[PDB]
């Protein structure tokens, strides 16, 4: 059994002069988990394909 | 109680079997009969 | 992992950028090291 998430995030694409269009590409991530042979999780990793 | 004990080890065992070798130290410039140390880590996270 | 996530990347971006909590991992290690004793000195109560 495996589980997963998509990260929703914001940071400014700040220009040196300053800018209004602070958006486009962000370090969002995608995360995976699984439950082990006693039901505790461990492989809560970030492949972020 | 033994089944809980067994599976508590067998969860850990597979991470060890997946360890990845990153680098190895040759004896400066020498060859033959070297101790040749190696360093390795877990792939699932860079923690160990 | 919490201490590392509070370190490897900044808290804030802008005219000022940063907020990486420098001491966080080494400050966390002492708590991890401490926890061993409360368990082993109560495994001694189990085996007593």
Instruction: Identify any residues that bridge with B40 across adjacent strands, giving them in sequence order.
Output: B21
First to last CA, chain B: 29
Interface check for A1 against chain B (CB to CB < 8 A): the answer is no
Q: Which residue has the tokens 């792939």?
A: B43
Token digits for B2? 């033994």
Q: In this structure, are residues C8 and C22 in contact, taking their beta carbons and an 8 Å threshold?
A: no
Determined by cryo-EM
Enumerate residues 6+ apart whose C-beta is below 8 A from C6. Answer: C20, C21, C24
With helix as H, strand as E and coil as C, how does chain A read?
A: CEEEEECCCCCCCCCCCCCCCCCCCCCCCEEEEEECCCCCECCCCCCCC
Q: Which residues of A touch B7 (CB under 8 A)?
A: 37-38
Interface-testing mutation among C4, C10, C13, with chain A (most A C-beta atoms within 10 A) = C13
**Three-class SS state of C2:** helix
HSE of B7, CA atoms in CB hemisphere, 13 A: 9
**Cβ-defined contact of A38 to B4 (cutoff 8 Å):** yes
Q: In this structure, are residues A32 and A3 in contact, taking their beta carbons and an 8 Å threshold?
A: yes
Interface check for A38 against chain B (CB to CB < 8 A): the answer is yes
Closest CA to A3 of A20, A45, A12: A45
First to last CA, chain C: 36
Token digits for A25? 């590409």
Q: Which long-range contacts does B26-35 make (Cβ < 8 Å, 24+ apart)? A: none
Query: Can you give the resolution of this entry in Å?
Result: 4.4
HSE of B37, CA atoms in CB hemisphere, 13 A: 4
């Amino acid at each position: 059994l495996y589980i997963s998430w998509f990260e929703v995030a914001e940071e400014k694409e700040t220009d040196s002069d300053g800018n209004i269009i602070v958006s486009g590409r962000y370090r969002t991530k995608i995360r995976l988990a699984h439950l082990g042979f006693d039901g505790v999780w461990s492989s809560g990793t970030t492949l972020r394909e | 109680v033994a089944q809980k004990a067994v599976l508590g080890y067998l969860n850990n065992f597979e991470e060890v079997s997946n360890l990845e070798i990153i680098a190895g130290y040759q004896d400066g410039i020498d060859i033959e009969n070297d101790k040749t140390y190696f360093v390795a880590r877990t792939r699932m996270q860079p923690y160990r | 992992t919490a201490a590392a996530a509070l370190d490897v990347i900044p808290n804030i971006y802008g005219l000022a950028v940063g907020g990486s909590h420098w001491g966080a991992p080494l400050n966390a290690a002492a708590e991890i090291i401490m926890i061993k004793y409360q368990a082993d000195s109560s495994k001694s109560e189990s085996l007593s």
